[PDB]
RNA sequence: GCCCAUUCGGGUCUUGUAAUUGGAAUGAGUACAAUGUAAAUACCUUAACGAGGAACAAUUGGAGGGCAAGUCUGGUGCCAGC
């Protein structure tokens, strides 16, 4: 706070989900969006790295642990 | 069964207590990091003022 | 070699018991033998005084073994009735103690008395 | 010293410099063109708090003072040496915290 | 400690009193309610 | 007059913790009280330094040092045994401001805290013998240390009870 | 596994250091004696004029070895620092290095004040908390962080 | 149009008291200050003794 | 807390000889040499071992013993190992010497000296019970009149209450302590100098030690248990001091 | 749950929030009266009043945040800045 008022930095409450669509409720704001989207990006990236290893499987691998 | 229920209760209290203590310590570690960032930025600009005040005697 | 060896003479007696009366008016004194040994084995004791003419002498001679073990000075005084008049109480108290307190305005006189009686012993 | 010997100089505002700056409370928004009277010249003063920029409009007989930055800021412009401390008799700090009232 | 209270281990010693059981039941129930 | 003086730097960490400890320990109001007591301590031991740096057996050093130690034992900050001049050089601000009336009536008892001591002796209750003192910063002399008691015209002594007590006695006897 | 974190020495406040009672113990060192001479101030009377209190100076065996080691230009300094008014410590460590001898000696006691003049020693001393340094200046001394300079 | 100021900030004697008794309780976390000693009977050290920790300043 | 009847585990500590007694609140505990009898009224753990045998342990009350506070504050190493010989300057009564005795064990000995008389008869009446200690009722300022009965101790310890602390420990350590041997002293600031304060008197005493050829290596303050004492641990070098 | 130290470490209910709440003491004032004074004010006294948000309302600065179905600028989506 340098040169502002407390009424200049009052609180903004957030509006609810409409009762007209209350069956599939809980309107989903920006913080919940970014917490969804970064999770989806991480899942897609790990799916694409295992897909890349599958496309380069190298079909002649062998260890002692593959007997049973 | 009394002892097993008691030990399960003690463990499920203690791991959650230590969990939120850890996340609180991490939360305040973030503000300590931001405070050190402001301090190093101010110190770096002060020293880059001083190192040319040391050369303006030329 | 009697059983009450560090017996104080007259002028040291008068200064230790006017320090006694100042402590009694400053609420810093414990009166009596068993409260003296209770505060002694609690630890809060600047120094303790006994009277060398109680009719059994051993009922306060049990205090040397506590006090010179827990490293606190102790002094005999030749009159239980004078020590009672010093403590400011009707019956003659025979064993007084001064508690330790760094929020008391007789710290200088207490330390002067304690240095004098450590030189005496 | 920065204007003869005085520490403060009365001045006449020409126009609010940068009303069309879109970013609110910015350096190019918080400037005015003051005509210094003591030698009759132009200068660019730096009124704090754009929310209290709009007290001063036009020839409001404003009273300037130096600025003296105590560090380095993010997007502050250099060149402005003068801040507004009093406008038309009253002090605009007291005006912005709305104790007094600007007289006209 | 009383002879009818000296249990065989500190687990049964901790079960033997009341305030610890009160705190454990309310804290554990609040933890299950917070997890659900 | 100008008793108090600003120190050689007022914005410093060790000085800030000094004023914090002294203020919260002896129950003080602002930095001006520590600065007044510190100033007059500095003045009297700056005067003591010159009497030390000149030679012994000078009449100036002899009876002016006797004057200074008589004044300091009269205030009470110097014990009865160290009656020579360099203990005045070894004086300290703590046992110099300890003799103010606030700390002194707390040490005497009768107040149960330093802050309660200050608020009652500014609520006009403590009188040194005969004179009601309503100011803390007194520096009570050594001779009148045992004349501190509640004043007789005050309801912690033996006067009429206060207005709160008698108003509550009225509207609790109704 | 023994870690060792030294406790903050319990005669210290946050940074007030109430252990420095007015009869002081100072730690003289080498270029402070040299600068005291080439500013022509005294030692004991100079410290008394700066601190208004009786100061007992100390020099260590490491600093005396440094003053002997610095050759014959500072025979005035060595004749001055063999003063019977001062006392003398006795160090036991390897390597006569006045800087780490001084800063070790003071950071394990927190009761000495350090009378130094060189830049690195002043930096380490004012880096570690709550011990006052003094130094020469103009024609007198100057204290850096004593809580009662006056 | 002022910030909400403080009842502690009103009287300077109070603010220089509630700053001290906080800083009195602050340095129960940098040292271990003397707090009277053995008050009751010895109920153990009551808060944890660890083996691998030496809080002793050593002589270089 | 820690009432009589709880079950407490007995874990070993770094300093061999002592043990941590971890219950719901912790204790410091030494393994008792003569079982069945407390010496100054402390509580005793009592474990059973398998012919069924039963061995007991004593707690170590740090508010009434000196070096227990140093142990709990955490010293880097003592020299009171389970085999050494330990001299005890200023053995007041059984209240600490019994703890140093049963730390030392059945092989090593503890020579406990004492100047006063009534603590002397209490020390002897305790000393008849366990055999690994030697009570001496002589002044610690004269180590040439009990030179007849002791020899070549392996660590000295000091609690005497006299302002010639350094001279006492220097004379007793020159007369008895072996080379490269330990010396653990416990200075009381208000005892040995009332005028100047704690850190100054500690630095003066440790300077007197390193003049008397004890190279010190540890200083601890033991502040939460006693006020303004200090534990100073040192070696006795005598050869290659630096 | 608190607090401290470039980080992992250290230490502590003997730590914070609650009108849960109780009575005691007051002078700012207000005021008979007397006092002072050329007369009068002020102070010094003082009966009767005079406190809980003790609202009988202490300020001046400074450092940080955080919040929207909001606004604006830039771009290598979901971002960065003001
Ligand atoms: Zn050295």
Swiss-Prot record, chain A:
It comes from the Eukaryota. Residues 1-22 are annotated as: Disordered. It is found in: Nucleus, Nucleolus. Signal peptide: none annotated. Residues 1-9 have a biased composition (Basic and acidic residues). Component of the ribosomal small subunit (SSU) processome composed of at least 40 protein subunits and snoRNA U3. Interacts with snoRNA U3. Interacts with EBP2, FAF1, MPP10, RPS16A and RRP14. Belongs to the UTP11 family. Involved in nucleolar processing of pre-18S ribosomal RNA. This is U3 small nucleolar RNA-associated protein 11. It comes from Saccharomyces cerevisiae (strain ATCC 204508 / S288c) (Baker's yeast). The lineage of its organism: Eukaryota, Fungi, Dikarya, Ascomycota, Saccharomycotina. The gene is UTP11. The chain holds residues 2 to 69 of 250 of the full protein.
UniProtKB/Swiss-Prot annotation, chain B:
Residues 17-30, 37-54 have a biased composition (Basic and acidic residues). Coiled coil: none annotated. It is found in: Cytoplasm; Nucleus, Nucleolus. Residues 17-58 are annotated as: Disordered. Belongs to the TRAFAC class translation factor GTPase superfamily. Bms1-like GTPase family. BMS1 subfamily. GTPase required for synthesis of 40S ribosomal subunits and for processing the 35S pre-rRNA at sites A0, A1, and A2. Controls access of pre-ribosomal RNA intermediates to RCL1 during ribosome biogenesis by binding of RCL1 in a GTP-dependent manner and, via its affinity to U3 snoRNA, delivering it to pre-ribosomes. GTP-binding and/or GTP hydrolysis may induce conformational rearrangements within the BMS1-RCL1 complex allowing the interaction of RCL1 with its RNA substrate. Required for RCL1 import into the nucleus. Interacts directly with RCL1 and the U3 snoRNA to form a stable subcomplex. Component of the 90S small subunit processome also known as 90S pre-ribosome that consists of the 35S pre-rRNA, early-associating ribosomal proteins most of which are part of the small ribosomal subunit, the U3 snoRNA and associated proteins. This is Ribosome biogenesis protein BMS1. It comes from Saccharomyces cerevisiae (strain ATCC 204508 / S288c) (Baker's yeast). The gene is BMS1. The chain holds residues 1107 to 1164 of 1183 of the full protein.
Curated annotation (Swiss-Prot), chain D:
Changing residue 25 to A: Lethal mutation. Keywords: Cytoplasm, Hydroxylation, Isopeptide bond, Ribonucleoprotein, Ribosomal protein, Ubl conjugation. Its main location: cytoplasm. The keyword Isomerase does not apply. One of its GO terms (molecular function) is structural constituent of ribosome. It is found in: Cytoplasm. One of its GO terms (biological process) is maturation of SSU-rRNA from tricistronic rRNA transcript (SSU-rRNA, 5.8S rRNA, LSU-rRNA). There is a cross-link at residue 16 (Glycyl lysine isopeptide (Lys-Gly) (interchain with G-Cter in ubiquitin)). GO terms for cellular component: cytosol; cytosolic small ribosomal subunit; ribosome. Hydroxylation at Pro-24 affects translation termination efficiency. The stereochemistry of the 3,4-dihydroxyproline has not yet been determined. The modification 3,4-dihydroxyproline is found at residue 24. Component of the ribosome, a large ribonucleoprotein complex responsible for the synthesis of proteins in the cell. The small ribosomal subunit (SSU) binds messenger RNAs (mRNAs) and translates the encoded message by selecting cognate aminoacyl-transfer RNA (tRNA) molecules. The large subunit (LSU) contains the ribosomal catalytic site termed the peptidyl transferase center (PTC), which catalyzes the formation of peptide bonds, thereby polymerizing the amino acids delivered by tRNAs into a polypeptide chain. Belongs to the universal ribosomal protein uS12 family. Present with 10600 molecules/cell in log phase SD medium. This is Small ribosomal subunit protein uS12A. It comes from Saccharomyces cerevisiae (strain ATCC 204508 / S288c). The gene is RPS23A. The chain holds residues 41 to 144 of 145 of the full protein.
UniProtKB/Swiss-Prot annotation, chain I:
Its EC number is 2.1.1.-. One of its GO terms (cellular component) is nucleolus. GO terms for molecular function: histone H2AQ104 methyltransferase activity; O-methyltransferase activity; RNA binding; rRNA methyltransferase activity. There is a cross-link at residue 66 (Glycyl lysine isopeptide (Lys-Gly) (interchain with G-Cter in ubiquitin)). Keywords: Isopeptide bond, Methylation, Methyltransferase, Nucleus, Ribonucleoprotein, Ribosome biogenesis, RNA-binding, rRNA processing, S-adenosyl-L-methionine, Transferase, Ubl conjugation. Residues 197-229 are annotated as: Helical. Changing residue 91 to V: In nop1.3; thermosensitive allele showing a decrease in histone-glutamine N-methyltransferase activity upon shift to restrictive temperature. GO terms for biological process: box C/D sno(s)RNA 3'-end processing; maturation of SSU-rRNA; regulation of transcription by RNA polymerase I; rRNA 2'-O-methylation; rRNA methylation; rRNA processing; snoRNA guided rRNA 2'-O-methylation. Changing residue 135 to S: In nop1.3; thermosensitive allele showing a decrease in histone-glutamine N-methyltransferase activity upon shift to restrictive temperature. It comes from the Eukaryota. The modification Omega-N-methylarginine is found at residue 3. Changing residue 25 to G: In nop1.3; thermosensitive allele showing a decrease in histone-glutamine N-methyltransferase activity upon shift to restrictive temperature. The modification Asymmetric dimethylarginine is found at residue 3. Belongs to the methyltransferase superfamily. Fibrillarin family. This is rRNA 2'-O-methyltransferase fibrillarin. The gene is NOP1. The chain holds residues 79 to 326 of 327 of the full protein.
């Amino acid at each position: 706070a340098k040169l502002v008022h407390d009424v200049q930095k009052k609180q903004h409450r957030e509006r609810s989900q409409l009762t007209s669509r209350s069956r599939y409720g809980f309107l989903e704001k920006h913080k919940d969006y970014v917490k969804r989207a970064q999770d989806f990006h991480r899942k897609q990236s790990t799916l694409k790295v295992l897909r890349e290893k599958a496309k380069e499987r190298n079909p002649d691998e062998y260890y002692h642990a593959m007997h049973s | 069964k009394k002892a097993r229920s008691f030990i399960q209760k003690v463990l499920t209290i203690s791991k959650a207590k230590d969990s939120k203590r850890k996340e609180q310590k991490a939360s305040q570690r973030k503000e300590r990091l931001k405070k050190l960032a402001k301090m190093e930025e101010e110190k770096s600009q002060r020293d880059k003022e001083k190192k040319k005040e040391y050369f303006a005697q030329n | 070699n009697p059983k009450a060896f560090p017996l104080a003479d007259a002028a040291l007696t008068q200064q230790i018991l006017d320090v006694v009366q100042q402590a009694a008016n400053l609420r810093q004194l414990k009166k009596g033998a068993n409260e003296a040994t209770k505060t002694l084995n609690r630890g809060i004791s600047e120094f303790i005084i006994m009277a060398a003419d109680c009719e059994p002498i051993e009922i306060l001679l049990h205090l040397p073994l506590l006090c010179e073990d827990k490293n606190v000075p102790y002094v005999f005084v030749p009159s239980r009735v004078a020590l009672g008049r010093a403590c400011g109480v009707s019956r003659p108290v025979i064993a007084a103690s001064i508690t330790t307190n760094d929020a008391s305005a007789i710290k200088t006189q207490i330390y002067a008395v304690k240095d004098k009686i450590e030189t005496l012993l | 010293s920065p204007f003869g010997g005085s520490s403060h100089a009365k001045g006449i505002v020409l126009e609010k410099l940068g009303i069309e700056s879109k970013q609110p409370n910015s350096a190019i928004r918080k400037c005015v063109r003051v005509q210094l009277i003591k030698n009759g010249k132009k200068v660019t003063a730096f009124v704090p708090n754009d929310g209290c920029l709009n007290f001063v409009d036009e020839n409001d007989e404003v009273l300037l003072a130096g600025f003296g930055r105590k560090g380095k800021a993010k997007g502050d412009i250099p060149g402005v040496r003068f801040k507004v401390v009093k406008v038309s008799g009253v002090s605009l700090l007291a005006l912005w915290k709305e104790k007094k009232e600007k007289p006209r | 400690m009383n002879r009818k209270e000296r249990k065989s281990t500190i687990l049964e010693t901790l079960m033997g009193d009341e305030a610890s059981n009160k705190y454990f039941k309310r804290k554990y129930n609040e933890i299950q309610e917070k997890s659900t | 007059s100008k008793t108090y003086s600003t120190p050689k730097r007022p914005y410093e960490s060790s000085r800030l913790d000094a004023e914090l400890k002294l203020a919260g320990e002896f129950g003080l109001k602002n930095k001006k009280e520590i600065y007044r007591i510190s100033f007059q301590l500095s003045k009297i031991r700056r005067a003591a330094r010159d009497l030390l740096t000149r030679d012994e057996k000078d009449p100036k050093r002899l009876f002016e040092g006797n004057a200074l130690i008589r004044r300091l034992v009269r205030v009470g900050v110097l014990s009865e045994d160290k009656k020579k001049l360099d203990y005045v050089l070894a004086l300290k601000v703590e046992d110099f401001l300890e003799r103010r009336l606030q700390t002194q009536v707390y040490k005497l008892g009768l107040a149960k805290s330093v802050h309660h001591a200050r608020v009652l002796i500014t609520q006009r209750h403590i009188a040194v013998g005969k004179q009601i003192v309503n100011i803390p910063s007194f520096m009570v002399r050594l001779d009148s240390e045992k004349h501190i008691d509640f004043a007789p015209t005050s309801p912690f002594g033996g006067a009429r009870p206060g207005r709160v007590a008698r108003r509550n006695a009225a509207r609790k006897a109704e | 596994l023994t870690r060792n974190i030294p406790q903050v020495s319990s005669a210290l406040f946050f940074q007030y250091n109430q252990a420095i009672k007015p009869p002081y113990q100072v730690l003289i060192d080498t270029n402070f004696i040299n600068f005291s001479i080439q500013k022509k101030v005294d030692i004991v009377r100079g410290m008394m004029d700066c601190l208004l209190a009786k100061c007992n100076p100390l020099i260590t065996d490491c600093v005396m070895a440094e003053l002997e080691k610095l050759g014959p230009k500072y025979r005035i300094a060595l004749k001055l620092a063999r003063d019977p008014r001062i006392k003398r410590l006795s160090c036991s460590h390897k390597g006569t290095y006045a800087n780490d001898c001084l800063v070790h000696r003071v950071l394990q006691h927190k009761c000495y004040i350090v009378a130094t003049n060189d830049a690195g020693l002043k930096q380490r001393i004012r880096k570690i908390p709550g011990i006052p340094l003094m130094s020469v200046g103009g024609h007198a001394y100057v204290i850096e962080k004593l809580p009662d300079v006056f | 149009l002022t910030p909400k100021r403080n009842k502690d900030n009103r009287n300077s004697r109070v603010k220089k008291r509630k700053k001290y008794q906080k800083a009195q309780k602050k340095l129960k976390s940098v040292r271990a200050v003397y707090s009277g000693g053995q008050s009751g009977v010895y109920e153990g050290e009551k808060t944890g003794i660890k083996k691998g920790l030496t809080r002793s300043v050593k002589f270089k | 807390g820690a009432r009589g009847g709880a079950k407490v585990v007995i874990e070993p500590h770094r300093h061999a000889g002592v043990y941590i007694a971890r219950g719901k609140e912790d204790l410091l505990v030494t393994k008792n040499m003569a079982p069945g009898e407390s010496v100054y009224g402390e509580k005793r753990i009592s474990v059973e071992e398998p012919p069924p045998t039963k061995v007991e342990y004593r707690v170590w009350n740090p508010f009434r013993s000196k070096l227990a506070a140093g142990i709990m504050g955490g010293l880097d190493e003592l020299f009171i190992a389970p085999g050494k010989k330990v001299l005890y300057l200023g053995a007041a009564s059984g209240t600490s010497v019994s703890h140093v005795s049963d730390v030392v064990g059945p092989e090593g000995v503890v020579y406990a000296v004492e100047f006063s008389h009534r603590p002397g008869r209490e020390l002897i009446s305790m000393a008849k019970k366990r055999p690994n200690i030697i009570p001496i009722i002589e002044d610690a300022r004269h180590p040439q009149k009990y030179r007849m009965l002791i020899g070549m101790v392996d660590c000295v310890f000091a609690d005497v209450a006299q302002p010639d602390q350094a001279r006492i420990i220097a004379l007793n350590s020159h007369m008895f302590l072996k080379d490269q041997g330990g010396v653990v002293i416990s200075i009381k600031a208000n005892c040995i100098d009332s005028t100047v304060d704690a850190e100054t008197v500690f630095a003066r005493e440790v300077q007197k030690l390193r003049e008397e050829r004890i190279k010190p290596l540890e200083q601890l303050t033991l502040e939460p248990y006693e006020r303004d004492h200090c534990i100073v641990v040192g070696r006795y070098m005598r050869s290659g001091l630096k």
